[PDB]
Amino acid sequence: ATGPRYKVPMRRRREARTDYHQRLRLLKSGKPRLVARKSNKHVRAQLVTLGPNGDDTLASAHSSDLAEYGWEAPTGNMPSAYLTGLLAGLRAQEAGVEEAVLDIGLNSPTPGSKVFAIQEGAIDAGLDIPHNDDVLADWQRTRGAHIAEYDEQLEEPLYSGDFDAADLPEHFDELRETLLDGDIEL
Amino acid sequence: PSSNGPLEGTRGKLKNKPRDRGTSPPQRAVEEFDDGEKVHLKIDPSVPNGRFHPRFDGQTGTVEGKQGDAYKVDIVDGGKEKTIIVTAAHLRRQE
Amino acid sequence: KPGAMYRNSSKPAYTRREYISGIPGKKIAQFDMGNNGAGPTYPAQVELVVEKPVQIRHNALEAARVAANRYVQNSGAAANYKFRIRKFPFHVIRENKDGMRAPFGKPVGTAARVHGANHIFIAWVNPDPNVEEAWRRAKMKVTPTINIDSSPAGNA
Amino acid sequence: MHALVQLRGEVNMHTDIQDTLEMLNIHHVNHCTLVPETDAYRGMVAKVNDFVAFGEPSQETLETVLATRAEPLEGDADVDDEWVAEHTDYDDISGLAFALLSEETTLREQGLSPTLRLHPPRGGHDGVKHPVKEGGQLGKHDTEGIDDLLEAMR
Amino acid sequence: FHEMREPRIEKVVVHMGIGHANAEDILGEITGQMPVRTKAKRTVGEFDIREGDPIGAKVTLRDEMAEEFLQTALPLAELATSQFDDTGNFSFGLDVTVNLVRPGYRVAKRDKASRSIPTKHRLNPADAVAFIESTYDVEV
RNA sequence: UUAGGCGGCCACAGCGGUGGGGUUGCCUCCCGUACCCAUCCCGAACACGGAAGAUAAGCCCACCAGCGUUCCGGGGAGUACUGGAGUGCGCGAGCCUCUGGGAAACCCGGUUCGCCGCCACC
RNA sequence: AGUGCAAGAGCAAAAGAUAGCUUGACAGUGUUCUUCCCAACGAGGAACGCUGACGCGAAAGCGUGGUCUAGCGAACCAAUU
RNA sequence: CCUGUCAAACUCCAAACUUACAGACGCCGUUUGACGCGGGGAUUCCGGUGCGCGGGGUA
Ligand SMILES: [Cl-]
Ligand SMILES: [Cl-]
Ligand SMILES: [Mg+2]
Ligand SMILES: [Mg+2]
Ligand SMILES: [Mg+2]
Ligand SMILES: [Mg+2]
Ligand SMILES: [Mg+2]
Ligand SMILES: [Mg+2]
Ligand SMILES: [Mg+2]
Ligand SMILES: [Mg+2]
Ligand SMILES: [Mg+2]
Ligand code: NA
Ligand code: NA
Ligand code: NA
Ligand code: NA
Ligand code: NA
Ligand code: NA
């Protein structure tokens, strides 16, 4: 920028998207990465491997294509994340993938977070992943209980129209249940 | 030389051009090589670990197994056979 | 001391003041002479060109310069002309003044390295080349044989 | 294809230069060899450039020298048309000569010594202290130039 | 276009740069939330050689906590103009600073894909005076 | 790829600037603190929950060369320097010829306002 | 800028700063380079492993003292485990 | 802005050249056994000069 001697960061460092110091440590395992990413409305989970010209995604799951299996609720929550993890995990298994390491990019290792939910799902799908059980949520919160009780303090639907008024952690079960047998793209 | 340490006279070979300055890309630090492969030896000024004695910068040896994550590369110093312990960060496939 | 001792450029460049101390001050008084208020807006421009690479001690520079400018007062103390000595004595020079034991000499002076064909002096005059004479006197006090060269001047 | 003739001795000549002459089958002053014009051979002759005389000879000249100084890989045998015919793929010296020049074969392939052991130049050469462009005899030569030399050393 | 271009108050820092405290107490009451210690850097003659060392406190107020404060702070100040930032900020007073900016600021304060706010989308001293002046008082 | 995620090369991608894009969908800004979690003080950030609003930031798309960078043409320059050779020149410093290589500065004109890979997706 | 100290080199979501926690400055045993280019030669040094036991981290992982190159000492004898 | 100069312990640049490995040609080796391995015996560790590049020194 300023002169010949100026040092310009690697592109993905300028874009503040990739932490290369963490990337390296991640690639050390030699295992596929379980890329856990979030969006204001959605949650994505990808199983990425290393390649000659860039990463190769062997399997992935987006919270949006969750409705494709009967999801009728918001997609930016805990139950959403878990299921996306499980969906991606299953597709992963189908692809011959057996193990992976949790890459949470620039997100924080907060206990009970969604990235960990994604991790819990991927593990349940059958994926062997280095983890720590007490940094994960307590199942109920994964089910979406924290939100149902939150709607108990109603007076006004937590969901603008959407589905239900008192919400449904049950809808969560029905879906998980579904994913655990047969069905297309799995 | 006025001294005889490993870094004697290594001011040029172990210094980066201002633009290549800073942490190196991890892609080449994880590269995998197979026994028999020819690799060029060259220390990456930015990468502290997995180095070899600077005298060998510029050698092209033959990977022959590994130790830990580092590779064991066979070279010939002058007329003498030597085995160098080096990490991918400092190696490149020949050709 | 004779120029014989330092006129050759056979030694390494020795100018790093960060590693050399006790360097004698230069005897060269000024580098810009005449009407330095004005810029080279003159008809004629003569130059003194060195014909061999040599080292010129600040001693000879000052003598060469004075002898020329001091003479350029054939035009007057405030005459219309500007005189420039473009070189500066960067090369530090030593002397081993024990015999050949620990002989790295001590700083005794400075010199300017001039390559054959460079111009050491440049004057600017109106068709009034008294400067051509100021130079016959200047290359008289420097080691090399020299070429007095006139550039802008087809007024022959 | 160029004709190589060593005109300067081994004494004091660089060793890597000497080994080059030797790889081109010349081991004595006045010995001549015929070398294809390739990138590899070109580098070698440039290195030897200062102790040799080279250039492309004419069909005739090559034939005169081949007849006069060619030899079997072993023995005294004269390499005349009959020899050439009874021992090589060609039917006569001219046939061989043409093949050499067109770099289709080599003196070895035809069971001949790679070296044409010439005779000193009758009338003397132009000196071994200056190149051709300076009146000397070293370096690249004209086809007419090489011919003169080769013929004087026939 | 507007609505997402109109100024807003982001944090009001009330700090008391003492030289060695008991002062926090008043800051807590003048604002409504705990104060924060102010360590100092460098060793200096004002018998302030201690690197890590309490030498004052500050309080960053956001949202209502910042308005409900300025709804009495501003009135206790007169100044305006020149005393304003090139980014549309201004400090008066015990110090009371007011950081002002427009709707898409989080883009430069978040962790992921953070980015520096374009000069055009920045807040100018003038565009700032307007917003505030247009809120219970007068400029210069 | 009508806006996404992970990357490779790591400025040809930087700096600065102009124009365009969101009617359901995307990324955002955005709205909001019962929860998991959080600020040595602040739901600013981090984390969680969510759509009333917006395309003004970001982002994506199209483009501008003033600065920085990459490569190329022409000039500088076959100059500077240089591997090999010489009973060539020079008091000498040094130079010259032959042979094999061959620059930097700078000027003028082009190029460059990233390219490519995997996945996902009216 | 800073990173204990020469000089040169390395480093920015860090190798720097702040905070917290921790004792891997751990035991055992090697591979290799260096010391000594090439090319034999000890002490010492370093790089990289393994076995065992641990620390921290969600985890990949990092920790074989200090970012790298100086800070070192045979046999005999003594004391110590 | 304009204008005058430098660097063994400066470098936005940058050769010739030296050098690791590989292929090709050459030359060489497979009765002259190369490359290499093991063993016996040395001598040697005052060197000098020319040319190129040097560092010191008035030389
Ligand atoms: Cl994310
Ligand atoms: Cl080594
Ligand atoms: Mg050097
Ligand atoms: Mg014979
Ligand atoms: Mg006669
Ligand atoms: Mg003669
Ligand atoms: Mg717009
Ligand atoms: Mg270390
Ligand atoms: Mg004793
Ligand atoms: Mg004791
Ligand atoms: Mg060399
Ligand atoms: Na680097
Ligand atoms: Na003495
Ligand atoms: Na003279
Ligand atoms: Na404190
Ligand atoms: Na926008
Ligand atoms: Na040792």
Coordinates of all heavy atoms in Angstrom, one line a residue, chain G residues 34-35 43-45, ligand 17:
Chain G
rU34 P 26.9 -32.3 10.6 OP1 27.5 -31.6 9.4 OP2 27.4 -33.6 11.0 O5' 27.1 -31.3 11.9 C5' 26.6 -29.9 11.7 C4' 26.7 -29.3 13.1 O4' 26.0 -30.0 14.0 C3' 28.1 -29.2 13.7 O3' 28.9 -28.1 13.1 C2' 27.8 -28.9 15.1 O2' 27.4 -27.6 15.4 C1' 26.6 -29.9 15.3 N1 26.9 -31.2 15.9 C2 27.2 -31.3 17.2 O2 27.1 -30.3 18.0 N3 27.5 -32.5 17.7 C4 27.6 -33.7 16.9 O4 27.8 -34.7 17.5 C5 27.3 -33.5 15.5 C6 27.0 -32.3 15.0
rU35 P 30.4 -28.3 12.9 OP1 30.9 -27.1 12.2 OP2 30.6 -29.6 12.3 O5' 31.0 -28.3 14.4 C5' 30.9 -27.1 15.2 C4' 31.3 -27.5 16.6 O4' 30.4 -28.5 17.1 C3' 32.7 -28.1 16.8 O3' 33.7 -27.1 16.9 C2' 32.5 -28.9 18.1 O2' 32.6 -28.1 19.3 C1' 31.1 -29.4 18.0 N1 31.0 -30.7 17.3 C2 31.0 -31.9 18.2 O2 31.1 -31.8 19.4 N3 31.0 -33.1 17.5 C4 30.9 -33.3 16.2 O4 31.0 -34.4 15.7 C5 30.9 -32.1 15.4 C6 31.0 -30.9 16.0
rA43 P 31.4 -37.3 24.5 OP1 30.7 -38.3 25.3 OP2 30.9 -36.9 23.2 O5' 31.6 -36.0 25.4 C5' 32.1 -36.1 26.8 C4' 32.4 -34.8 27.4 O4' 33.4 -34.1 26.6 C3' 31.2 -33.8 27.4 O3' 30.2 -34.1 28.4 C2' 31.9 -32.5 27.5 O2' 32.3 -32.2 28.8 C1' 33.1 -32.7 26.6 N9 32.8 -32.3 25.2 C8 32.4 -33.1 24.2 N7 32.2 -32.4 23.1 C5 32.5 -31.1 23.4 C6 32.5 -29.9 22.7 N6 32.2 -29.8 21.4 N1 32.8 -28.7 23.3 C2 33.1 -28.8 24.6 N3 33.2 -29.9 25.4 C4 32.9 -31.0 24.7
rG44 P 28.7 -33.9 28.1 OP1 28.0 -34.1 29.4 OP2 28.3 -34.9 27.0 O5' 28.5 -32.5 27.6 C5' 28.7 -31.3 28.4 C4' 28.8 -30.0 27.6 O4' 29.8 -30.2 26.6 C3' 27.5 -29.7 26.9 O3' 26.5 -29.1 27.7 C2' 28.1 -28.7 25.8 O2' 28.4 -27.5 26.3 C1' 29.4 -29.5 25.4 N9 29.1 -30.4 24.4 C8 29.2 -31.8 24.5 N7 28.9 -32.4 23.4 C5 28.7 -31.4 22.5 C6 28.4 -31.5 21.1 O6 28.2 -32.5 20.4 N1 28.2 -30.2 20.6 C2 28.4 -29.0 21.3 N2 28.2 -27.9 20.6 N3 28.7 -29.0 22.5 C4 28.8 -30.2 23.1
rG45 P 25.0 -29.5 27.5 OP1 24.2 -28.8 28.6 OP2 24.8 -30.9 27.3 O5' 24.6 -28.8 26.1 C5' 24.8 -27.3 25.9 C4' 24.6 -26.9 24.5 O4' 25.6 -27.6 23.6 C3' 23.3 -27.3 23.8 O3' 22.3 -26.4 24.2 C2' 23.7 -27.2 22.3 O2' 23.8 -25.8 22.0 C1' 25.1 -27.8 22.3 N9 25.0 -29.2 22.0 C8 25.3 -30.3 22.9 N7 25.2 -31.5 22.4 C5 24.8 -31.2 21.0 C6 24.6 -32.1 20.0 O6 24.6 -33.3 19.9 N1 24.3 -31.4 18.8 C2 24.2 -30.0 18.7 N2 23.9 -29.5 17.5 N3 24.5 -29.2 19.7 C4 24.8 -29.8 20.8
Ligands
NA17 NA 28.3 -34.8 21.5

